[PDB]
From a paper:
Carotenoid cleavage dioxygenases (CCDs) are non-heme FeII enzymes that catalyze the oxidative cleavage of alkene bonds in carotenoids, stilbenoids, and related compounds. pmcCarotenoid cleavage dioxygenases (CCDs) are a broadly distributed superfamily of enzymes that catalyze the reaction of dioxygen (O2) with carotenoids, stilbenoids, and related redox-active polyenes. These enzymes use a mononuclear non-heme FeII center to activate O2 for reaction with a specific alkene group in the substrate, generating carbonyl-containing products of importance in biological processes such as hormonal signaling and light detection. Unlike many mononuclear non-heme iron dioxygenases that coordinate their FeII centers using a 2-His, 1-Glu/Asp “facial triad” motif, CCDs use a 4-His cluster, three of which hydrogen bond to second-sphere carboxylates (Glu/Asp).
To further investigate the contribution of the occluding residue to the CAO1 active site structure, a T151V substitution was introduced at the occluding site, as found in some carotenoid-cleaving CCDs like NdCCD. As this decrease in energy reflects distortion toward trigonal bipyramidal geometry induced by substrate binding, the smaller magnitude of the shift indicates a more limited FeII geometric distortion. This difference in distortion was also manifested in the crystal structure of T151V FeII–CAO1 in complex with piceatannol where a ∼6° compression of ∠His197Nε–Fe–H2O is observed versus a 21° compression of the corresponding angle in the wildtype enzyme. Inspection of the piceatannol binding mode in the T151V structure revealed some small but notable differences compared with that of the wildtype enzyme that could be responsible for the different outcomes in iron center distortion. First, the β-ring of piceatannol is rotated ∼7° away from the Val151 side chain as expected based on the less favorable interaction between the piceatannol 3′-hydroxyl group and the non-native Val151 methyl group. As a possible consequence, the piceatannol molecule is shifted away from the iron center by ∼0.13 Å, which reduces steric interactions with the iron-bound solvent.
Residue numbers in the entry:
A (entry chain A), B (entry chain D): 30 to 526
The structure:
Amino acid sequence: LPPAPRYFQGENTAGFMRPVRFEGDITNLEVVGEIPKSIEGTFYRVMPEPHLPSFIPNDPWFNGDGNISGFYFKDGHVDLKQRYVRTEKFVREAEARRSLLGKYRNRYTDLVEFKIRSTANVNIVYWRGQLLALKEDSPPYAMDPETLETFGVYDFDGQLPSLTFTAHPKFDPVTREMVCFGYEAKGDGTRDICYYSFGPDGKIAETVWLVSPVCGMIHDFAVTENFVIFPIIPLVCDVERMKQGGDHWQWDYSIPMYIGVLPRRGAQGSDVKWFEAPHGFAGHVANAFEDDKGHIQLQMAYAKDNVFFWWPDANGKGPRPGEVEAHFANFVLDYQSDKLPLAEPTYLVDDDMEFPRIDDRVATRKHKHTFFCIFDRKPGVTDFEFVMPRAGGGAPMSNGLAHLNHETGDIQRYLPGPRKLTGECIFIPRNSEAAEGDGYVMVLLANYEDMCSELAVLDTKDLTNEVALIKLPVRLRPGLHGNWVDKSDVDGHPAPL
Amino acid sequence: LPPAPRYFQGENTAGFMRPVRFEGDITNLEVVGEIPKSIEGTFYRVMPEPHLPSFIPNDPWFNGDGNISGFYFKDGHVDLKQRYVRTEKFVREAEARRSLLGKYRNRYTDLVEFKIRSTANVNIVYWRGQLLALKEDSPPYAMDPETLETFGVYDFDGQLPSLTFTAHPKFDPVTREMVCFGYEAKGDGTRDICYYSFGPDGKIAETVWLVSPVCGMIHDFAVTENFVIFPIIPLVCDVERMKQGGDHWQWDYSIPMYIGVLPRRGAQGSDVKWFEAPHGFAGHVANAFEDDKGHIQLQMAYAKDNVFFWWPDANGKGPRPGEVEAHFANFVLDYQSDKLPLAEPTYLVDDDMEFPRIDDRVATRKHKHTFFCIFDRKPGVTDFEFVMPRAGGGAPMSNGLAHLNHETGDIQRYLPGPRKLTGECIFIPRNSEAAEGDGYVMVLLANYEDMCSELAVLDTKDLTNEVALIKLPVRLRPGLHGNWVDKSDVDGHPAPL
Ligand SMILES: Oc1cc(O)cc(/C=C/c2ccc(O)c(O)c2)c1
Ligand SMILES: Oc1cc(O)cc(/C=C/c2ccc(O)c(O)c2)c1
Ligand SMILES: [Fe+2]
Ligand SMILES: [Fe+2]
């Protein structure tokens, strides 16, 4: 077999990116300031964190075993529980005590035949009394919210119609449905998209098979009252390239950014309209809604070049690290229009941003608050001379959060400091009567001075001020998505406004 | 109640001394070099590590909750498991989410009434299929060697005759007995010493009650074929002082270092002879044995002033940090002699040393190898300018190990490096046929550059060279004692030479 290294090497596992690989508990975390005593619930987040050194050199960040963190809050106290998802990959590699899975989404490079290749490392959501650890090439892995035990691959009582389940399902706060899809829904290189939904009782509602114009990456999607919307990143899969040991994904400069629109209920596959936005990268969706005219307002991060620059085009053409900025874009779509080309979007702010969150009590409806990561290159905001030698590589960087009020246009910015960077934030309603966007924001910080992680708690009344700073004595490696599960919400999701 | 701080403050919990307080697992530790594939077994060590900030300012290191590390070795791979001893203190404080136990060994300062005050934080030994987590003011806590679950307070099937069990029992490699004692054996301030032993079947053998000349600290003891030996540190307990909120221990410059000698079998309490060594501090015993004449050779660390300087004399007189050195001393005792005063000891080496280990296959018999911690103030060995600002306080420092060959007088020194310090080492026989002192040495390092811990593996053929360096991504706080449990030893202890 290819030799198994016995320690981590390469920039993607250097400095703050070095895997820790701890599972267990740290109770009664140290707190500076004061956690609001009324906060009660759990912040779950997932990070890629390779359990064993890869036999693939410079294995991408996206290919690391999913490790789940839970921060359990009650009466101003907080405990951490941490556990790896017991994926097939995790278990078989742990048994062998060496890496067996090869390149990102390329089964032809695996040292053994896997049934499920999930690292379950992208998102961690709450559904009907379980956590679902998500990875868009795979079904979810179900886990216990209290103990973080892995139950196993989850197929929704045999109802799951797709081989794949998106990392970005949407929770309709009015219908209490989970709205889902999978792309490459029939396997590697397939153009099949399966759109499906589950009612609050767990029974499958929608199931619509449609066909993508290209086998492109559909990382995120959007849901409105009457439509679902599929933006396609111009990364394209060719299985013949994979069989020769090549990358699953390859940028294509010659195609638009397709945006499919399908009626949300009762549709057939042929009802989808593939609108064509200007070539660019479809980033995370903040939210989408239908306005007064019945037009879809789609608000999402959008860049003009390949954010995933390590997967360039066929001639190796693509940007360099730190070059591509994504901006908070508004696209307007009309399902009735027969014109496929879309205009350039309008932009809501100037900041280089990503990882937008809204008050999920208005998801699929008009929202007027968005919280998001920013990366400000203005001199002084980040001490790059100090941070970059300690940072390693392979992961995006955020040096603040921003809160946009869409009505007033006011923006507040939280800057943790010149030697700290942030992950994706969560929003917590102050209580069940709170106005939209009124409550608390939490965000995990990487402190490059201490080489430790911290969890900041902010009040939306003044995002610039930390109300509490929870000081972890270990590093939590840069992660991906996370969610709040409030103790007052029986089904884990907040009540509609 | 006295206010409970919500983060750690003071030098004793600063820098590398900051509690991490993690429990759980890190499998497949990163390894630089190569762990000898024949090594099979577990290195257990214990560290004081406060689970909650104390309400006592500058609480001594010795008063922190015992946290057990196990390093499980097989076929050149190693896993870490880590778990707190579930003492009464740990459990009740965890329930309350605040500190309740007060000053070191002073129940009159506790906020609630404890039955058992153990932090179980001094030593962790193997006996008849269990770990025993030790603290000299208490009975042992029994634990599972595989899972580190705490079973509870252990009383040897109701046979334990004493309130107290030493942190330094000795294992006779020929008789397979565990030889024990407790001081303050009938409660705070008592001069009662209970000497007792257990046969390999778990039945109590010896039980002899004797009386100390003063209520002094007997931290360690020594066992020969025919004698047991009790060196008394001139720290003295007055329960009336304690009732007023004072310290359990107070130095007394006016007394000798008593060394009691009792026949090992069949004795009465009045058979003890209290020899009087020159005033000084009784450090750890390497080993004791009877020579050809039947004289006891007692080899132990010995200092001329109070190593525990934070417990000074009645007028607050004593040394400052880093001032007192201890030296590897040989005392000669003759049980038949009626002369009580002893001569100054001879010294085996000149190094400032402590934490001596021998090949325990010759414990209680003549040994000719000792491994020990050293602290070398020779310029450059430790980069103090770099280390001391990162180190915190409250714990002793070791910047190397030494191996003394007692036949030849040869000394090898292992120096981990200018920005690393060491804990107490363990010795592992190469195999069951290995000569005395031939095999492997392991020692945990504090790396102040990375602010991480490492576990070094050395071959005794060349102690200056690391064969493997196991790289932990977390800190293990400076700890106390540890032990090797070899997989090839049915009762957990090595066979006699
Ligand atoms: O900074 C960004 C911006 C973005 O728009 C998306 C991502 C992550 C996407 C992702 C996609 C597939 C994976 O398997 C995976 O681990 C991660 C990260
Ligand atoms: O550096 C040294 C030298 C020494 O000779 C003894 C000790 C530790 C003694 C000790 C005594 C009682 C306790 O409760 C405890 O945690 C530790 C530490
Ligand atoms: Fe995402
Ligand atoms: Fe000791």
